[PDB]
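User: Predict structure, ligand zinc ion.
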Amino acid sequence: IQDLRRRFFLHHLIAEXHTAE
Amino acid sequence: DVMTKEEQIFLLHRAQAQCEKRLKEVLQRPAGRPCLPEWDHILCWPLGAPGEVVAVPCPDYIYDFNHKGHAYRRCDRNGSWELVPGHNRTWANYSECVKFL
Ligand SMILES: [Zn+2]
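Assistant: Predicted complex:
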């Protein structure tokens, strides 16, 4: 996949906001 | 349909606005010491029962989310959202909502 811009944006939100490492 | 990054950001701003209301309302009707509503840039965590895990369905407005799963936070007996052990960040588990976790 779809919009990689959308996907890679969600990568950032999940990376900082999933904190259980 | 294939949601765009701009559409996704718009829905987040709309969801963030809904989180501001749920906060103001609760902060206008205060009661006890539960975990307060909180916006973590993805979803709006609701009032948390102290001492328990708070489960929130993976938000429907996030396109790349499994909407049959839940995200989790920990609310301690003091009414504060628990931090990750050894780190200064609020603990949250999003592994059910996403494939790459
Ligand atoms: Zn990037």
